[PDB]
């Protein structure tokens, strides 16, 4: 005669140590503006 709940711990703390996903997310942005500038030059 007993019941219990449970609480999760989210972990995935390798990502969580940083903001969350910055491996191919923030770097992609970094190099994608570079693509934009080079294409601007190519079209110019």
């Amino acid at each position: 005669g007993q019941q219990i709940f449970s609480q999760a711990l989210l972990n995935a703390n390798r990502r969580g140590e940083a903001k969350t996903a910055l491996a191919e997310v923030q770097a992609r942005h970094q190099e994608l503006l570079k693509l934009e500038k080079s294409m601007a030059e190519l079209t110019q």
Partner: protein, 528 residues
């Protein structure tokens, strides 16, 4: 510690002894270090402050940082230590000690003293010796503290202060030597401390001429027998709300401000009385009970009451004076309705001892047997603390459940009472116990009569003169009326035996209906 200081200069009133005890914490660190190692004594590292809600602890914790030189104790509330991530909460505790640790390892013993204070400690430090088998974070956290707390590795410049409202919850694993040694209980203020709390709270009030001179603090302190400091500023602000609301008429109309009267705003005593009428402590004892018992009041209709009262005075003096009489018990018996409880209440109230209590079936109403047993024991236990104590027991027969058919009654309560009435209090306490009853023969017969030192009879009134006294006191009728009624009663029924309560009842009934003889006399005659 700053030299530009004395203990007077801060708002904590009443708690002076506790200040001395806690200071008596910092004494070891006043001297140059060289003495103490040569004296082979370690410093205390853990502190606990605790008391009922609303005693002032948070004010001490906030304000102490001023006295205690260097820079600042760090502050944290319990439930922010826990955290989302695995191992983050575990980290968080063991991040705080870093600064002090670093400075210490570098500088040795020259280290400035570091203080950290956990407000509301009980949030997370429940017994690690517990179960429920959820995620075990609630264990890991406390483990961490203990590791950094016990095996400090010679970190001897840290003082943890724990603030709580409820001591018992906390792990027994924190309450041992070397870890939270001293536990200081802060309890409700005395009357002097109550005065100082008024002093500090009404300080600013008093300087800038906002308070009427009519007010006299001492009587306010005298009235407010049962209040926390929190309650006291509550009362102050209630009073001010009254005082302010006389110019601004909220609701009715618009905002009508008499800009002139704003300069003349002043609180007054009656505001304070209304403010008292609003607030009510959870202190709870509400011993005003005594006065409602004697609300019918005492008129001294005869000499017998006077003699009885003088005897009561003799006994209270006796117990107060002698040291070998540490326990006295008395019985008060008479016919039903003669009026007995009121007389005991009179004696008790006139006594003016520090501690008074009454036991009546009314509060005992509605519990089961075992609960009644517990209650009785608890109240006795409580009674044993103060040096001088008055305790009254009301209508024993009703408490013990006497009904004559069986006769049926509950033995266990009777045994409890019998045993308790013979028990001398602990050393250097005295006690005075006053029991009343109305059916003496039963008390004889079950044979507990041997536990009472002296007995007082209270016969009811019988002579028409006393009737004249009480009725003139009640202002029932005009003078000729009060004469004619007694003259008629003299011949209607000279032999006379009623009591007192019934007389009052008849007086009121006749007053309403037909204050001529034809009702009041009739009712006494039927009753008598």
């Amino acid at each position: 510690i700053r030299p530009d200081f004395k203990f007077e200069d801060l708002g904590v009133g009443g708690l002076d002894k506790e200040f001395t005890k806690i200071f008596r914490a910092f004494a070891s660190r006043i001297f140059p270090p060289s003495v103490i190692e040569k004296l082979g004594i370690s410093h205390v590292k853990g502190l606990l402050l605790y008391g009922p809600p609303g005693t002032g602890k948070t004010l001490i914790a906030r304000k102490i940082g001023t006295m205690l030189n260097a820079k600042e104790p760090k502050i944290v509330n319990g439930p922010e230590i826990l955290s989302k991530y695995v191992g983050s909460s575990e980290e968080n505790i063991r991040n705080l000690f870093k600064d002090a640790e670093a400075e210490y390892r570098a500088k040795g013993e020259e280290s400035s003293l570091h203080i950290i204070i956990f407000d509301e400690l009980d949030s997370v430090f429940k017994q690690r010796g517990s179960r429920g088998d959820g995620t075990g974070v609630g264990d890991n956290v406390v483990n961490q503290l203990l590791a950094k707390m016990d095996g400090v590795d010679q970190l001897n410049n840290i003082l943890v202060i724990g603030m709580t409202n409820r001591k018992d919850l906390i792990d027994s694993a924190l309450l041992r030597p070397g870890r939270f040694e001293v536990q200081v209980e802060i309890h409700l203020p005395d009357e002097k401390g109550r005065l100082q709390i008024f002093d500090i709270q009404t300080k600013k009030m008093r300087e800038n001429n906002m308070m009427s001179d009519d007010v006299n603090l001492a009587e306010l302190a005298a009235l407010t027998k049962n209040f926390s400091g929190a309650e006291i500023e509550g009362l102050v602000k209630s009073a001010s709300s009254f005082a302010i609301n006389k110019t601004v008429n909220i609701g009715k109309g618009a905002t009508k401000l008499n800009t002139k009267d704003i300069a003349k705003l002043k609180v007054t005593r009656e505001d304070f009385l209304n403010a008292l009428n609003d607030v009510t402590p959870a202190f709870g004892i509400s011993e005003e009970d005594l006065k409602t018992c004697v609300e019918g009041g005492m008129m001294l209709y005869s000499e017998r009451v006077n003699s009885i009262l003088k005897n009561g005075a003799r006994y209270v003096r006796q117990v107060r004076e002698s040291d070998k009489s540490r326990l006295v018990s008395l019985l008060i018996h008479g016919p039903a309705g003669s009026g007995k409880t009121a007389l005991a209440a009179e004696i008790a109230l006139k006594s003016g001892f520090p501690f008074i209590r009454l036991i009546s079936p009314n509060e005992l109403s509605g519990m089961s047997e075992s609960a009644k047993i517990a209650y009785i024991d608890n109240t006795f236990r409580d009674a044993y603390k103060s040096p001088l104590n008055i305790l009254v027991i009301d209508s024993l027969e009703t408490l013990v459940d006497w009904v004559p058919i069986g006769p049926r009654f509950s033995n266990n309560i009777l045994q409890m009472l019998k045993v308790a009435l013979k028990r001398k209090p602990p050393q250097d306490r005295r006690l005075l116990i006053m029991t009343t009853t109305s059916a003496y023969s039963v008390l004889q017969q079950m044979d507990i009569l041997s536990c009472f030192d002296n007995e007082i009879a209270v016969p009811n009134m019988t002579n028409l003169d006393e009737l004249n006294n009480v009725m003139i006191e009640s202002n029932f009728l005009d003078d000729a009326g009060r004469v004619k009624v007694i003259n008629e009663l003299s011949r209607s029924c000279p032999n006379f035996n009623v009591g007192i309560k019934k007389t009052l009842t008849n007086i009121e009934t006749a007053r309403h209906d037909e204050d001529p003889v034809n009702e009041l006399v009739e009712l006494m005659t039927q009753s008598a």
